[PDB]
């Protein structure tokens, strides 16, 4: 539909072009795939960090302790 352009170092363009031709795909497709992978990494890291920070917050601990009462439901 619409395409744009990103500036890279020529060495990095060569390495990405390798990776694209290794997988049998276009460079555009490769960068789409790798963008989604980076998104997933950032998302899960955001969750991990948020949860560890929330262990200090006792309102969170109370909340999950209350929700843990359901642990045995339907069994």
């Amino acid at each position: 539909s619409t395409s744009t352009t990103i500036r890279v170092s020529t060495q990095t363009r060569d390495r990405l072009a390798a990776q694209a031709r290794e997988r049998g795909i276009s460079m555009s497709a490769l960068l789409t795939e790798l963008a989604a992978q980076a998104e997933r990494q950032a998302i899960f890291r955001a969750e991990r960090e948020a949860s560890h920070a929330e262990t200090t917050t006792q309102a969170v601990r109370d909340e999950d302790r209350e929700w843990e009462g359901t642990v045995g439901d339907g069994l």
Partner: protein, 110 residues
């Protein structure tokens, strides 16, 4: 009287007995409901105290909460239907879609 929950609703849920209440989003489909008390309805707890993240889409007071809250999709769980106290509201379609995408990532779905 047994609650009639529908997917996308925000409900008040009873914990530890059928004292402690917390809001949750019904995310299981309604084709599963058969009117039993112990049947499991899968919900996502809604928290006003956990910090906001991509896997915790926001939930607005127009959707049934008292204060700005987040849907903790990592806490998705089946609960007995008898724990459903009162319908608090309904989530907008954009919120439901964000919950669906969060759940897809959490459970490794393709």
């Amino acid at each position: 009287l047994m609650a009639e929950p529908r997917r996308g609703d925000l409900w008040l849920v009873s914990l530890g007995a059928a004292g402690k209440h917390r809001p949750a989003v019904v995310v299981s489909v309604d084709e599963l409901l058969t009117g039993i008390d112990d049947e499991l309805v899968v919900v996502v707890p809604v928290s006003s105290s956990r910090s906001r993240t991509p896997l915790r889409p926001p939930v607005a007071p127009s959707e049934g909460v008292a204060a700005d809250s987040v849907a903790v999709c990592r806490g998705v769980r089946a609960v007995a239907r008898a724990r459903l106290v009162e319908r608090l509201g309904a989530l907008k379609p954009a919120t439901m879609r964000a919950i669906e995408n969060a759940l897809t990532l959490i459970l490794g779905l393709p």
